[PDB]
């Protein structure tokens, strides 16, 4: 029927002034207590680029080209083999040529290539999915490159809103990151065409996402509140159980695996089972932020170019925890060194300047509280694990741990404070495992690798645990 | 490896 599209509630739109703009993390700090509730929000940039994105790509960068990927929008269920073969059949284009091709296919569909009204193209996307005869769209996802100008004059490029600068911003908890991560530490370019889509995802680590549209047609996002995440996944399986918008129906998967086989489904089904959905229609010059654990999907209305990066502030730390456990439960190597980030942030808060942590926003305060809580819980657990270990008498060696984060060979959880190493060095395990029941081919001698400064961190934990709101 | 995600 598609009337639901017209009556979807829109997400909050903020239009700060230049003086309000500051940097995106402080701004998100300020607006968090309301936008948080929606999972998705939109910020109109009060700063214009002096050099537009096509010009920055053509002149500031040399021979910029990119390869595309082919998505099947909606068709008799595509099996994994057929899927994988055509995902990267896509040809390599030049910005100008991808634009030209997309606008030709758009003209072909609607006799003219002029942008069309948003309600029209959205209804068209959902009806095309339901019964369209077109098979595929080309989308240049995940391109490494940036359309912000390196020019010093450019007000947007020289601002702290440039995606290139965000991960190293003072309130970016990933500023502490050791090594770069594509899309996480550094932005990526997304270049779309008519009906090129991004299906429902919760991101990596429930981390925040920030996306800026540089140019082109509108982009429609559907966002779910972090609050609704469980309900979201619940309904999906039920409705995949119902054979409503049915997938391949394997019925033996982790949740993203199931999502990765479904034809993208309309928000109406989500509204029918009473899970909140908000719409954002993103134009050039607008940032869309997705909040940690906020599910979102979306599609393009035509040729367009956007730029996105994932980030974290301290309020994200509880969500990170949840992701970690799921990562472990699904026995998957985590994206981020969670424990290391807890420790580094917490010991930066410990030994603070203290001339800073006085009058500050409630959301930052809550994030600091969440960092301290994560730190205190981690140190208490590791203390009792170490006590148990010592009394077992199965731990032969103790070694000052000088490494970065390592991955436990059984669960796959990140280990920063401590791990138990073996004889060959290929079966280290986190302290969550009963060492008596370790059956390792290398032997039985177990060596505890422990961070050198554990005493300082224990003192920090005992300081924090007496502090207000950290119980 | 360190990265974001999709099917190749
Ligand atoms: O812009 C796109 O193609 C999709 N964006 C995202 O998934 C995001 O930034 O959260
Ligand atoms: Ni996303
Ligand atoms: Zn483990
Ligand atoms: Zn071994």
Numbering used by the authors:
A (entry chain A): 93 to 563
B (entry chain B): 24 to 31
The authors write:
To investigate the substrate recognition and catalytic mechanism of JMJ13, we determined the crystal structure of JMJ13CD in complex with the α-KG analog N-oxalylglycine (NOG) and an H3K27me3 peptide, at 2.6 Å resolution. Overall the structure closely resembles the JMJ13-α-KG complex with a root-mean-square deviation (RMSD) of 0.49 Å. The peptide binds in a negatively charged cleft with the residues H3K27me3 to H3P30 located at the bottom of the cleft and the other flanking residues extending out from the cleft. The interactions between JMJ13 and the H3K27me3 peptide are restricted to the region between H3R26 and H3P30. H3P30 positions its side chain prolyl ring such that the plane of the propyl ring is parallel with and stacks on top of the phenyl ring of Phe179 of JMJ13, resulting in hydrophobic stacking and CH-π interactions.
JMJ13 has a central catalytic domain flanked by flexible regions on both N- and C-termini.
